Design a protein around this ligand. Structure first.
Ligand SMILES: [Fe+3]
Ligand SMILES: [Fe+3]
Lengths: 472, 473, 165
């Protein structure tokens, strides 16, 4: 049992209560009780965590990300439109990674993520097809203690239209191999079903498995319908990348949202990612079927895609979470940095300093994010009965001083290093910035290994790591 | 007295943009005296050696336009408001309620944040210099801290009567907060600024400079702007003005502020303009023609709902565009690395062009081009012989900055702003292993509590709401 | 007749001087038709509307109701709008105003009428606004936030060449 005491609790509960000098009691992975110190004595606990002078929040929820690609950041990944990045960087880089590289990628990602207060990660696994990768990744997620949705991507249909464009893009890095990860529909089903049977609900309920048809052009109608029915039969969600680029825009003369509507493929268990190339009608169609959304505001900028209509969706009460997207289209895994970006980009583009409140941005990173993953009954707020995914932030630093309104301070001032202590499913995963799965005496050597492995991955893939200085 | 920084990777920002692995820098009497590569040359003897092994050495970051004292108004009171709403309901009244002893604490807090993020030069646009005691309080702290400072003394000498019914409506949003005026007579502004320059310009070993700062083209007379212009020329400094930050500035007398200034011969190579959001192609051509310097406040232009300035166009014309963090309470951080990432992304998003500004270019804007925007590029902004020793040491051995191959990309797209370890300004160690010379670790927490209290009290005296009720929509 | 009727009594208590040279030009289209004024002093509008409400509100078997109706945000003072707002609250009715029907209404003092009303706390759940043609995304958000009611005059917005809300 664990008692967190004397903090300010930012509950994100139904009344958005903010409780000064208050406590939380945790038992068997759950929040069992809460109270105010002046009115009540906290129950006895095996241990007390002192949060005096600190702010307690629900853990941040990364609503859509791609983990293993983190080893491709730091030089190779920037300055390219989506498809250029995909074909010259992501596909070949992923392919050159071995299972032992994956294990290091995952631990590096989880170290950055937990340090920034992320406790749930929706991993869209585009490299699950390669032998050994699932097993390597899953062993590290389990050990680390993070809550993970492992959304297994598949592609079962050739999009032949885009080929002369692809060859031109490939000529930018001709020594880098063009890859294919297409699989037959029935093979994808069997592989995802077996993955779910083996890993879903493992690591004490912390790991889930979803089917992830990649896009409306890369997956057949049958494949998407299978994913849809699978989500329904197993009480999970299914997810798809929607309208991330201007070449996706026209699946057969209508938008991807329209196309899915025609086939009855929009439902309340679908979470779509991106939605940059969206019009009013598309928003209406998602709204009507209660589709969940993950917005990758930073990555949409990094890749030169654009700006999604998040304010419109939010004003319709839609469940919109925030994803950091790829470890190499951001290039950080920092929810607080992404929140600030979500606040500012929309203000700038609408010329409206009040287009999204910092409270609302904080909601997107917590309780609404949970809702976007279909997990809001279990996580995303500090409420009795929910899982004990909790973070303690210290605002006593120069950047976060002064602080009066907590959501404003967090969104507009915090850098992302203010998170001290992190609980996931009631287990202490970080304490005073010390990571339980990467102790301080191993941290530097681990980073050097990740650095070396990245350098080697890029050599095997024939990718340029450090292009010559260019001002224009 | 001498200092040797050894075994770092030097990101010089010099004329060839040299990046020198396992290299050294020798510092003497506030100046970079020599550099070299360890494998080809032995460093000169020095009184002390700073070991930068495994670290990256950069020129110090340059904050090309900011407002310091306002930092005590962040944390609740300042967000969610268009420029004029923010100005009249927050900034003016908040500043007015601050006493000199509050100003001293504001300045130290700002400098602590700034130095911790690698900022070594600050262009402080002082909008509260009119209040007795404020200059002296601020200057003593800047001096003690060791930071390089341009103190640009803002003035307003003309009523802009057009915007009054708009102002009253805006004031009704916070009716208990007092409307207040900082207008002065032209001649009084001139005398005050001249005296401030005579007393403080070149002080603190040359670290402190004084510029005149006519506020805007509507708040200052032609005569006031011409005086500022001539003053800059006679004293070999710059003058600065806020340009086209909002859609209500846009029309000084039926043309843009740039056109208006052109008409009166007020665009010249010693002018540094701030903002330039409401700018068209012609305005950019006019600034370009006269070699006007520009400070872009990309983050604040978003925060205040103003928009996005045409930075790519200016940069492609070779113009000197620096990056400013702007107000301590329209950002609301003082973090150059965070703002660089925002500069990189906002423009990519708006142009739908992932390559619209390279991370190298963004790093140039924060260093050598920033120096150029202040007219100080002969003295600072690059690691070159003869220039001042304003240098920062970054450690990239953290999760977020791993892996790292291309340094500018890593810094711009991965660094959070806490990776700066050690900071030199004018050759003096102002920060070492994150320990601040002017705010030692055993005083830090108590100082932050005092800033917090003083802020709470400032807001009470001004009748400003600190912590508005939770609002989702 | 037996119809259910809300009688929203319009008033105007403030001169909008800005639009006068425009008005004279318009008047020259029919110069023999006289230019009229229906302005009243604030206190007179209040007394008249109060007396009308006391006399007719709830009559004809509850079929007739009386609301105050400040005409627009440029033709009524802040004090007049606030009185209407409080009157609606005290008597459990609504108040109503014409909003942003034309491109010359658009700028009450350098912001939209919705913004102007928000500044003074004049958007609430008992307000019903009419028209909303010259409205942007921010205006819609402001109304939504305060649960303002809306009447849309789609045919008339066409007939008069205003546009489409
Ligand atoms: Fe994605
Ligand atoms: Fe400014």
């Amino acid at each position: 049992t664990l008692s967190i005491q004397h903090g300010t609790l930012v509950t994100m509960d139904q009344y958005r209560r903010v409780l000064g000098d208050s406590w939380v009691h945790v038992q068997d992975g759950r929040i069992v009780a809460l109270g105010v110190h002046a009115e009540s004595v906290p129950p006895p606990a095996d241990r007390v965590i002192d949060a005096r002078g600190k702010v307690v929040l629900p853990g941040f929820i990364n609503a859509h990300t791609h983990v293993n690609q983190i080893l491709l950041r730091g030089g190779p990944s920037h300055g390219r439109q989506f498809y250029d990045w995909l074909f010259n960087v992501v596909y070949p880089g992923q392919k050159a990674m071995r299972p032992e590289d994956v294990a290091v990628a995952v631990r590096l990602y989880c170290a950055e993520a937990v340090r920034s207060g992320i406790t749930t990660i929706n991993e869209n696994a585009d490299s699950a097809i390669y032998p050994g990768n699932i097993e390597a990744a899953m062993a590290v997620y389990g050990e680390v203690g993070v809550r993970v949705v492992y959304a297994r991507m598949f592609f079962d249909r050739m999009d032949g239209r885009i080929q002369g464009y692809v060859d031109a893009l490939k000529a930018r890095s001709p020594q880098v191999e063009l890859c294919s990860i297409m699989e037959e529909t029935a093979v994808a089903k069997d592989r995802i079903t077996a993955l779910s049977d083996q890993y879903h609900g493992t690591a004490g309920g912390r790991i889930s498995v979803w089917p992830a048809p990649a896009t409306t052009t890369a997956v057949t109608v049958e494949g998407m319908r299978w994913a849809q029915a699978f989500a329904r039969d197993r009480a999970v969600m299914w997810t798809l990348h929607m309208a991330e680029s201007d070449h996706d825009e026209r699946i057969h003369g209508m938008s991807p949202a329209e196309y899915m509507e025609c086939y009855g493929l929009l439902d309340e268990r679908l979470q779509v990612a991106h939605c940059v190339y969206f019009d009013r009608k598309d928003v209406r169609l998602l709204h009507r079927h209660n589709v969940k959304v993950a917005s990758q505001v930073v990555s949409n900028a990094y890749l030169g895609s654009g700006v999604a209509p998040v304010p419109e969706m939010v004003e319709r009460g839609m469940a919109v979470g925030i994803g950091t997207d790829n470890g190499n289209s951001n290039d950080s895994v920092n929810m607080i940095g992404d929140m600030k970006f979500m606040a500012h980009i929309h203000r700038a583009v609408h010329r409206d300093a009040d287009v999204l409140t910092p409270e609302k941005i904080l909601e997107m990173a917590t309780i609404d994010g949970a809702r976007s993953l279909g997990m809001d009954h279990e996580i995303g707020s500090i409420e009795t009965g929910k899982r004990a995914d909790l973070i303690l932030l210290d605002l006593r630093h120069p950047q976060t001083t002064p602080h009066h309104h907590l959501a404003a301070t967090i969104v507009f001032q915090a850098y992302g290093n203010e998170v001290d202590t992190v609980l996931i499913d009631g287990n202490v995963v970080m304490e005073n910035r010390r990571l339980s799965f990467l102790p301080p005496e191993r941290e530097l050597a681990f980073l050097e290994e990740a650095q070396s492995r990245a350098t080697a991955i890029l050599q095997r893939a024939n990718m340029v790591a450090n292009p010559a200085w260019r001002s224009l």
